[PDB]
From a paper:
Ribosome-associated quality control facilitates the degradation of incomplete translation products and requires dissociation of the stalled ribosomes. The RQT complex of yeast is composed of the ATP-dependent Ski2-like RNA helicase Slh1 (Rqt2), the ubiquitin-binding CUE domain containing protein Cue3 (Rqt3) and the zinc-finger containing protein Rqt4. We propose that the Ski2-like helicase 1 (Slh1) subunit of RQT applies a pulling force on the mRNA, causing destabilizing conformational changes of the small ribosomal subunit, ultimately resulting in subunit dissociation.
In contrast, when analyzing the samples treated with wt RQT, we mainly observed post-splitting products with almost no stable disomes being detected anymore. The majority of particles represented various populations of 80S monosomes and a substantial amount of 40S subunits as well as 60S subunits carrying a peptidyl-tRNA and eIF6, together confirming that splitting reactions took place.
Residue numbers in the entry:
A (entry chain BF): 2 to 297
B (entry chain BK): 1 to 220
C (entry chain BL): 6 to 174
D (entry chain BU): 2 to 160
Write the structure that this text describes.
Amino acid sequence: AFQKDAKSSAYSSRFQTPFRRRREGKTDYYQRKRLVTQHKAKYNTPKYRLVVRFTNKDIICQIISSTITGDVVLAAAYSHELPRYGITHGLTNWAAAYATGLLIARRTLQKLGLDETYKGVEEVEGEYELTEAVEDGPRPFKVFLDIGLQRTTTGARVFGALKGASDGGLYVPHSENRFPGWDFETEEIDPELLRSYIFGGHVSQYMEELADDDEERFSELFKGYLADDIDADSLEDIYTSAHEAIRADPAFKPTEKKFTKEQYAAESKKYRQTKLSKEERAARVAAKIAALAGQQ
Amino acid sequence: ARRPARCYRYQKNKPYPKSRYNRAVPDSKIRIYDLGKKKATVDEFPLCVHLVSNELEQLSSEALEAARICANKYMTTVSGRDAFHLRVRVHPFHVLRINKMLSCAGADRLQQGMRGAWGKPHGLAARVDIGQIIFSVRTKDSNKDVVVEGLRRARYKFPGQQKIILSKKWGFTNLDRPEYLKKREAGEVKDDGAFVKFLSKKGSLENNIREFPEYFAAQA
Amino acid sequence: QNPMRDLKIEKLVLNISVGESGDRLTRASKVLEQLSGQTPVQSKARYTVRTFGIRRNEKIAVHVTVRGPKAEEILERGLKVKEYQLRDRNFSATGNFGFGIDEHIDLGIKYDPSIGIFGMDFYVVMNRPGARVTRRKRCKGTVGNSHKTTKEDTVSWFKQKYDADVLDK
Amino acid sequence: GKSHGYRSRTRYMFQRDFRKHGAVHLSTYLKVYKVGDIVDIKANGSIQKGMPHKFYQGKTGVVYNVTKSSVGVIINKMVGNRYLEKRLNLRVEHIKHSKCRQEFLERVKANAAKRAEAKAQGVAVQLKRQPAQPRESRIVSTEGNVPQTLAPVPYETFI
RNA sequence: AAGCUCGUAUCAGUUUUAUGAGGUAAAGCGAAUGAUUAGAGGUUCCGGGGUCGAAAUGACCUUGACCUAUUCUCAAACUUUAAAUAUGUAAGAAGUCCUUGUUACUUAAUUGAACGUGGACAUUUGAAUGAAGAGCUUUUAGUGGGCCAUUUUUGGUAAGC
RNA sequence: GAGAACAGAAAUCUCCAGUAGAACAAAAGGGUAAAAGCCCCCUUGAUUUUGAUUUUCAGUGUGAAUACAAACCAUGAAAGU
RNA sequence: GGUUGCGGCCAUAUCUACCAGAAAGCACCGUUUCCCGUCCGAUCAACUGUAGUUAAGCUGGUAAGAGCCUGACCGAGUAGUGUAGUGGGUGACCAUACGCGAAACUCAGGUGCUGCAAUCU
C-alpha cells in the first residue's frame, strides 16, 4: 500500500524481465550454461547431469538430460521409497543422501542393462576412489552434479549422495577437499570419520550424547526410535542392512497409487474457481455504475 | 552584423541544435511566447484563427519577436488586453553560423583563404514546415474582425507567403466545435487551469467519481 | 483471527560514533565486549569530509548486533535512564524504533575514569515469524503487505507491555 | 586523423536489443551443427569472443569446420572485381540455421511424395514451380450488392 | 595480342518464391537523455520574505524549487516503431532415400561424425527470361592533372566555389 | 523515503523502494545484475612448439584479434574457464 | 485439474491493490553435540518431522487497473520513396503517370502455453 513511489507507466513499459525459472529464483543461469553446453564436435551425444536439491524433509535425486523442447529425465530416485528398503526414519540426514546415492546409481544400470560390470565398491571404508574404467569393456558412465543455489561448504548433505553416486557404480568427477572431515590445516583425510558419517555416525553419537546428559531434550525429539524401540547400537546396523537391500531388487516398483487420474482431476475442478466471461465483466460494471455511480 | 535573412531564409542544412557539442550560442531573441489573457479558461474563447505558412523556409527569432510585438500592440489598444490569448507555436532551435570575414583590407592577413571555413554561431532561427500552424489568437466570436486584421498586420514581418485561415473546433483544444458543445453538458469536461482535461473510459472507476461528479448523477 | 503470527524482536544493533581516530577507538570498541558479551567489529568510512577531521578508510566507528532470547534483556536496562518515556515520533514507517543515550555508565559497570563517558546508541528491528523469505537463497520472495510491520503496529505492540507513555502530542 | 578501427561505425549495429538484454538463452547452444549446413550470421554483443567483423552481418555461408566451441564458415567476399573464398571461424552464439534452406528440404520430399503417386496413377508430373499466373475469367454478382456511386470530395481545410 | 581445354556445359550490372541482415526517410518524446512553453491539484519543518504571536516540527499569504494529471515546439553525434531504393543466400545429380564398412576421433553403447561399397529416382532432374559459346593461361603498350548533368548530401551567404 | 547523543547538508548504524539511472585505469560507443560491479582463498595461461583465419590489404608485411592442434599447469567439488 | 524437481518459449506470465486455497507438496517452523562460517547460527552449516501452522511464500480469482501482446476497408494509399517528362512555379517547393508503402492516433480482444519424472480428496 505504498502509493508514494508510484511506479510510472513508463517504468513498467521498458522494464526488462528475467527468465521464468529465474524470476522465481530457482535457477542460476551463469552456472547453468557452462554445465549443459556439449562439445560441438561430439554432435548429438547428450550430456547427462545428476541433480541434488535438498528440500524440506526430502531429497531430490534423478538423472536428467537436456533438449531444446525441455530437459529429459532418464531415471529418478526419491527419499520416500527408502522406507520400503527399510530406512523408515531419518529421511533428511547426511547418511540418507548416501543411501539414495547408492539407490540412484544402481537404479540407472538395470534399465541400461549394464549392471553386470562397474559394481563400484561393496565394502565402503570411506576411502577416496573413482570407478576406474574396466579393461576390454564399456567405458564407465559419467555424470555431473547439480547444486545451483546452496553454498558449497564441506560436510554438506549434497556430497552424501555424491559418495553414493561415486561408490554406487558411477563415475562422477569430484575431489576430497569438501567431504565431511577433510582437514583444512593440511591435506590430511580421515576415512574413519567419514565411514561413521556415511553410516550415520553423527546421529548415532548424538544418541548417547542425550541418553546420559538430558532426557527431556532426548524425549521431545527422536519420537520414532523410542516408539519403534530402536537404539544407537542398532542404528548403524540399519544402514548396513540397507545397502545390500537396495542392490537386491532396485526395480523402482511403482506405488499402487490408489484411485485413478480422473477422480484426482475431478476433485480439482469441483472446488477450483474458473475464469470470468466478458458478459459477466460487463454485467457487474453496469451494476456497479448503477449502484454506486447512480447515487442510489 | 545581422546580415539580411535572404541568406538564412531557405532550409539549407540539417538541424543544428544547442547540445553539449554546441556551446557559446547566443540567446534567443524571443523571450515570452504565450501572452494576453493566458489564465483564460477554455469555454470563454470559442474562436481562434490560425496563421499557416505555405512553403518551406526558416523563420528567425528576430522575425518571431518583431511579429509578436506588432500583433500584441494592436489588439491591446483596440480590443483591450483582456480580449485575446495569443500564443507563438514555433521555437527557434536551429543555430545560424557565419564565417566572419573582416571588412578592412585583408587577403594578406584576413583569413589565409577559406581554409577551415567552419564558423561560429551568429543567431538562432526556427525551422518552419509546410502548412505548419504558426500563432494562435483564442478570441471571442464578437472580436473576429479585429483579430483577423491583427494577424494580417503581423504576416508582413515574416519572410514568405504565409496565409491566414478561418480555423474551427475551438482552436485551443482538439476535437470539433459542434462535438465540443455536445460534450460541454454531457459531462466530459473538467474546468482546469488554462487547458481542459478530457474524460477517459479506460481508467479506474473510483477516482473518476471525485473530479468528474456531474456525469453519473442526474445533472441537467 | 490471531494465528501464531505476532511481532517479535529480530535483532538489536549497537553503534558508537567517534569524533576522530586514536586510542579512544580501542577504548570504545572494548566496551561492547562486556555489554553484548561478544566481539564487536569495525565500521569503515565511505568518503572524505575534510572538515570533520576524518577521511577515506580511517575506521571511524565500531558496531555490534545482538539477536535471539539474549537480546531483549538489554532493552529494559537501556530504558531505565529515560524513565521509561518515549515519543510519538522515533518510530520508523517500517515498524522499528531506536534511541541514543550518553553517560552509558548508568547502564552499570564501574565508572573507571580511564574509560570516560560513551554515548552508545540503540536501534531494534522487529519482524514476524516468517520474514525469512526476504533472506532466503532459493525462491527469494517479499513480505506481504498485510504482513509487513507498520508504525501503528509497533506502537500498538509496544504499548501493551512496559506500561510506557508516548508524550508530546 | 581518420578512424578505421576493427569495429568502427558500429553503434546501432552491435546493440543487444530493446527489452531483450541479459544473458543469451540456452536454445542457441543446444542446436546441432554439422559440416555442410547453410547458416546465417547475426553478431551477438553479449560475448565478444568469436564475434565476426562488422562487414559480415546477415551474410550466409557454409559450415566446414566444427571445433569444441566454435564453427567455421566460408564467406564469398566481393573485393575488387572478383570473389574470394574467405574462411571465418565463429562461436555458436553468432550463428543460426538459415531456414531458407530447410524449406527446400521438405520440397524435395514433397515432390518425391507425389512422385510415387505420379507413377502409380500415370504421367502428370507438373512439379516445376509455376509463377503467379494471370487470373482467369470470372463473373461477379449484383443480387444483394448494388454499385455505389462515388465522387471526388470537395476541398475543405478542417484545421 | 598470342592463344589453350572442351563444346550448351553452365552463367547473368535482370525478375519472381522463400528467408536473413541493415537504423536512413518518416514518426515519437501525455516513452528513456537533452531541451522546451503555460497553467491546475499538494508540498516545504530537512527553504527564504509579509499580519499576529515569548514561541516552534504556531494560525493566514507569497517567493524559488519538488510530486501528480496536462499542454505548445524539436534533436547528425536522441529513441520504443519503422519504410522506399539498394543488399546476403537457396531454387538441388558435387541431390534424396534403404542396407552396409573403415577410423588411432567421439560416445555408457558397430551409439555418433567423413567418404565409399549394393538398389531406386532422368528429361516439366524438379522458378522466369536471355545466352554472336563456357572456362583457363602468358605477355605487354598507354593510364594514374579530369570535368559536366539528374538524383542525395558536406563546408561557405553565394559562386562558371 | 523513514528513523539514532553529540551528528546539522555531507561522521557511523537499521528498514523500504529502487532494470541500474552506479562501477568496470585512462577518450567515445556497445556489453554487463545470483553478473564483466564489492570484497575474499589460491595462482601466475602475461607458459612451450610452430601452423590456420579476420581487419587495414595488393589480398604483401606490420599492429591487433579469432578459434584450434601436440605438452606442462592455475583454479573450482565438478562441468568448465 | 492441483503440487514438487529439472526445464523450453520467455513480461498474451511484469507491477499495483483486494479476496480464496479440505487434498498432497511447497515454505515458516523446533533443536546448537559432531561438519562449517559469521559480531550476531539472522543467511550459510548439521538433526527429528518432533511441539503449530497455511499468518507469510507459492498458487488461484477481480480491477470501467498501470503495462504487454494480438487484430482492425481506425488513422491511411496519409507521410515517405524508385522510375519520367523542354510538367508548374524565377525561386523555394508542388502536382501528374507507372510502382512500393510506414509510424503516431483510435477501436476491439487476451492478460500464459508446454516437455520430462514423481505424486496429490
